[PDB]
Design an enzyme around this catalytic site. Structure first.
Site, mmCIF file in Angstrom:
data_model
loop_
_atom_site.group_PDB
_atom_site.id
_atom_site.type_symbol
_atom_site.label_atom_id
_atom_site.label_comp_id
_atom_site.label_asym_id
_atom_site.label_seq_id
_atom_site.Cartn_x
_atom_site.Cartn_y
_atom_site.Cartn_z
ATOM 1 N N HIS B 41 -1.457 30.867 119.000
ATOM 2 C CA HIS B 41 -2.073 32.059 119.571
ATOM 3 C C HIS B 41 -2.512 31.863 121.022
ATOM 4 O O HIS B 41 -3.301 32.667 121.530
ATOM 5 C CB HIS B 41 -3.250 32.520 118.700
ATOM 6 N N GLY B 143 -12.686 28.408 123.549
ATOM 7 C CA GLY B 143 -11.975 27.341 124.215
ATOM 8 C C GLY B 143 -11.853 26.062 123.418
ATOM 9 O O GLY B 143 -11.209 25.115 123.891
ATOM 10 N N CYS B 145 -10.267 25.846 120.593
ATOM 11 C CA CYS B 145 -9.026 25.873 119.833
ATOM 12 C C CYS B 145 -8.093 24.766 120.306
ATOM 13 O O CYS B 145 -8.008 24.467 121.501
ATOM 14 C CB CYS B 145 -8.351 27.238 119.972
#
EC number: 3.4.19.12
Lengths: 306, 306
Positions: B41, B143, B145
Site C-alpha cells: 500500500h 510512517g 509501516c
C-alpha cells in the site's frame, strides 16, 4: 497508536561488546576506540570476592594476563589501569565500529536500555530505570557482568551503566562508565542491602498522560489538588516528592492532552487511595514508574535516531 | 536472576532497514540481498485505501517511480513485482550487511522482536506475541509501516512479521514476509475487527515457572488437577485449550523446577478463580501470556546468539 516498553536499537552497542578473560574468570567488556572497559572484579576468583585488595591483586597481573576477544579476533593488551571500580585495557587496534559516544552519569528515575551479554556475545535487550535507591531491576545471570546500559540520542551513544553484581535481595547494582558505583554499593561479596525503593512519581504521571493519548480515560477524575496536598498523599504511599521541575517537565504532555499537571495529580491521588478497582491502564493493573516524560514523548510522537 | 521482557539484539536488522518512497507516501522496507521488501500500500494515497485495485495501481508505476533510500544511499530499482500483500523491488546493488535469514510464518502464541522504524530509520524495539486472533499489540504511529518482526537463533535472522495497518480498535495487523496477512485482515481501510482475543495458556504456565525460578512461590498450591478439568476452567475465563503438546513443551521447565505441569495447572486454576488477592508475580498484578516456554528457557539459562 499503542504503548509498550521500548529499548533503543542495540546495533551500535553490539559492535563494542567484547569478552575479557583473566584467569578462570570471564565477563564482558566495552571496546571504544583503543580502550576496553570492563568490571574490575575480573581479576578476582570466587574466593577473592569476600574482601579483595584490588590494588594488590592488580599488581600480580601484567598486560599479557588479560585475554580480550572481539568475536574471533583477539585484542593484544598493551596497558592496564583501574579508576574506581572499572578497568581500562589499552589495546593495540581501535574498534572500527566505535560510534559517537559519551560517558554520562544518569540521575535516579531516568531510564536506559540494557544489552545483556555473556562471553562477549549480546543475548538480549530490555528497558530499565535507575531506581531511587540506585538499584536497577534487570535480569542478570552468571557471566552477564560487563553488560552496559545506554541511551541513543540523534546518533550519539550515551553510555550510563555497567552491571557489576547481583545483590542478595535479587536486584542489581553497578557503576557508571568511569567506575563509580551508583549508590552506596561496593564490588565485594558482603551483606549489602538497598534502601527504601520508592516510586518515581513524575514517571507515573507521564505514563498516565500516555494512557490518555492512547484512549484510556477512566482515571481522569472530576477533582483537583495542590502540590502540597498531593505530596502529603505521595509520602503515605512511598512516592517521590513531586517538585516544580517535574511539573515543568510534564509541560508538553500537559499541553498535548489538555489535562493540567495538578489535575492529573488528583487522578493519581485517587488511584493511590482507591486502587484500580479491577480495571487496567495500558494493559497493566499496577502503576508503572519506568517511563520517563521523555520516554512517552518518544513513543507518542515517533522520534527516530539512526 | 531477574526476569524482564527481552528482545533480540536488533543490530542485524538495522542494517536492512531502508526507506521506500512512492509518490506522496513513504514507509520502511527490508533490504535483503538485491531485493527490497515493503508493504504494497505504498503505491496508494490516502484516498485509494478505501478500495484499492492494487494490480491496476501497480500498472501505472514503473521502476523509476520507486525511491528507495538506504541512509543517504539510493538504490536504483530495476524491477518490481507483488506477491500477496508485499512488494519486491529488485535493486542493482546487494546489501553488504545481509545476515543469514529465513522467512518464517510463525504460529499464534509465539513471540518475536519488533524493530519500529520511521522513514527507514530504526526508532526502538519491543517484544510482542502473535495473539490467538492473529493480531499483535505493538505500538505504531504513521510512517511505521514496513517495520519487521523477527527472532534470532544462533546467527540466523528469522523474519516473521511486517506491519501493515492499525485497526480501528487500536491493535495492529500485518503479513509474513511473503505478503500473506496473519488472520482474515486485508490491506484496505474498511470495517475490520479481530475476533475474541483469548489468553495463551501455555505461555502463562511458562511465565509461572519463571516465577518459581526467580523466587515467587506464593501461588504454588497444595492441590492438583487433570487436563480435562483444567480445560473446563480455562474456557470459562477465555483461555486457550491446553493440549498434551503444551505439556510436553513445558517438560524442561517442569524438570528444572520440580513442579509437574498438571500441578502448575491447578495453581493457575486457583489464580483464575481467586485472582491475585492483591499480590504480584514477577512485578505484575495480572497473568502474563507473552512469554513462550522458549522465552523463559532463554532467560533462565542465558542463551547467546551473536
Amino acid at each position: 497508536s499503542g504503548f509498550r516498553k521500548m529499548t533503543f536499537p542495540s546495533g551500535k552497542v553490539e559492535g563494542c561488546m567484547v569478552q575479557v578473560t583473566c584467569g578462570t574468570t570471564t565477563l564482558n567488556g566495552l571496546w571504544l576506540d583503543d580502550v576496553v572497559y570492563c568490571p574490575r572484579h575480573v581479576i578476582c576468583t570466587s574466593e577473592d570476592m569476600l574482601n579483595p585488595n584490588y590494588e594488590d591483586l592488580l599488581i600480580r597481573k601484567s598486560n599479557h594476563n588479560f585475554l580480550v576477544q572481539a568475536g574471533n579476533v583477539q585484542l593484544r593488551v598493551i596497558g592496564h589501569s583501574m579508576q574506581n571500580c572499572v578497568l581500562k585495557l589499552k589495546v593495540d587496534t581501535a574498534n572500527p565500529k566505535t560510534p559517537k559516544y559519551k560517558f554520562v552519569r544518569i540521575q535516579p528515575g531516568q531510564t536506559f536500555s540494557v544489552l545483556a551479554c555473556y562471553n562477549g556475545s549480546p543475548s538480549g535487550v530490555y528497558q530499565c530505570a535507575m531506581r531511587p535507591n540506585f538499584t536497577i531491576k534487570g535480569s542478570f545471570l552468571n557471566g552477564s557482568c560487563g553488560s552496559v546500559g545506554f541511551n541513543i540520542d540523534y546518533d550519539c551513544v550515551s553510555f550510563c551503566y555497567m552491571h557489576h553484581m547481583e545483590l542478595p535481595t535479587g536486584v542489581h547494582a553497578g557503576t557508571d562508565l568511569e567506575g563509580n558505583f551508583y549508590g552506596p554499593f561496593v564490588d565485594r561479596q558482603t551483606a549489602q542491602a538497598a534502601g527504601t525503593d520508592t516510586t518515581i512519581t513524575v514517571n507515573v504521571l507521564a505514563w498516565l498522560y500516555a494512557a490518555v493519548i492512547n484512549g484510556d480515560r477512566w482515571f481522569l477524575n472530576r477533582f483537583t489538588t495542590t502540590l502540597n496536598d498531593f505530596n502529603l498523599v505521595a509520602m503515605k504511599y512511598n512516592y517521590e516528592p513531586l517538585t516544580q521541575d517535574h511539573v515543568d517537565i510534564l509541560g508538553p504532555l500537559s499541553a498535548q492532552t489538555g489535562i493540567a499537571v495538578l489535575d492529573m495529580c488528583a487522578s493519581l491521588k485517587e488511584l493511590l487511595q482507591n486502587g484500580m478497582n479491577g480495571r487496567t491502564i495500558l494493559g497493566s493493573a499496577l502503576l508503572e514508574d519506568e517511563f520517563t516524560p521523555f520516554d512517552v514523548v518518544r513513543q507518542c510522537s515517533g522520534v527516530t535516531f539512526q
